[PDB]
Amino acid sequence: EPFLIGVSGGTASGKSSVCAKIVQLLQKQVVILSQDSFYRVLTSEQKAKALKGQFNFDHPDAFDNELILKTLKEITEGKTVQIPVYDFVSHSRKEETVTVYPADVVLFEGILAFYSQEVRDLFQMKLFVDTDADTRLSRRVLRDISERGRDLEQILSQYITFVKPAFEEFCLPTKKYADVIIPRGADNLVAINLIVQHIQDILN
Template sequence: MSDSRRNSCKINGSNNKTPFLIGVSGGTASGKSTVCKRIMEKLGQVNKNQSERQVVCISQDSFYRDLTQAEITKAEKGQFNFDHPDAFNEIYMKETLLDILAGKIVKIPTYDYKNHTLRKDEIITIYPADVVLFEGILVFYFPEVRNLFHMKLFVDTDSDTRLARRVPRDINERGRDLEQVLNQYTNFVKPAFEEFCSPTKKFADVIIPRGADNVVAIDLIVLHIMDIVRGQNRMNGIQVIAQPKRIK
């Protein structure tokens, strides 16, 4: 992380917070969302209202670009490559992250996997937060997006494990049938992982083997996040007194 980037992570005098931005990448079904969920749980964030959260999580899926009619037809036959960088709206992604870093309130659509469209009727409002997690298969692919992160995590889960998780998830949660899931995996998901996602592992600051099962790694990351949030509060004039553990 560059010093200028680290220094820019502070709470401005007003309500405008410049959050600490963490990118979380990894192959499909590697456990990115679960790692983010665990981080938020350990920070006691999940039961809080969005506007009072200090830590929020956004998915890169909200930044798929709108498809043309011809592309929707292809997607319905499992012939559209959702794992290719071209499937994303890079500019919208970058501008949203810049707005978040500027402490603005942003509204982002959720993604509907069944219809392969953004749900503009279901909008998530992201309020200024101390820490923002941004997770997705290609969050480190686009240099201008990658350079915005203060910290980069790569969830490194074995590809057999990922496929074994992906199949039931796509069938149960994303309305697919087995043949479609396996065809899509072989034709698009696996080759795109090897070409576009896996090479971005080298940009990570921390690689998390075994994903959400890796409690030690997640605990270390959470401690780091807590340090940052406390540091920011201190800069804002609010002293948070950490109780150092006594070694007996």
């Protein structure tokens, strides 16, 4: 069976980088899936909220947890699966889909990857990325304006109304499940080195 690794942390904490850095240091086939690929398909009403930054994309229900469980389960079965593609500028699930063939190691990263116990138990290892909040906000802002076409005021309002409160209520609590908490994120090469070394040993 593949080796699943759950990676979590608040928004813009660097979960993706940490996943890339781990792959970089790890022959063993590896792939990185992201939980935000499974954002639920919004209604016309909901999508209207999102444009005004009045939608909670940080709540456990904002994710297609059902689809996540199935997809992850099949991967665990060694089957090759299809994965949805989410458009962050339109708040909509794209029509296209990505193929992901079997692998020896599978990293799944997202703000709420440890929330559901069903999904949480599929991970042979769980890591939590811890980054200062003002450092995180700063990145969320540059990324949102840049890569996701949004307005400064929309971002801060959404952050202050949904992201931060949701983080303290749903995200942070899941840290108690991590097997390894990584302060400073990807910059913590020592923590990441111990991790890739641990992964290698289990695969031997």
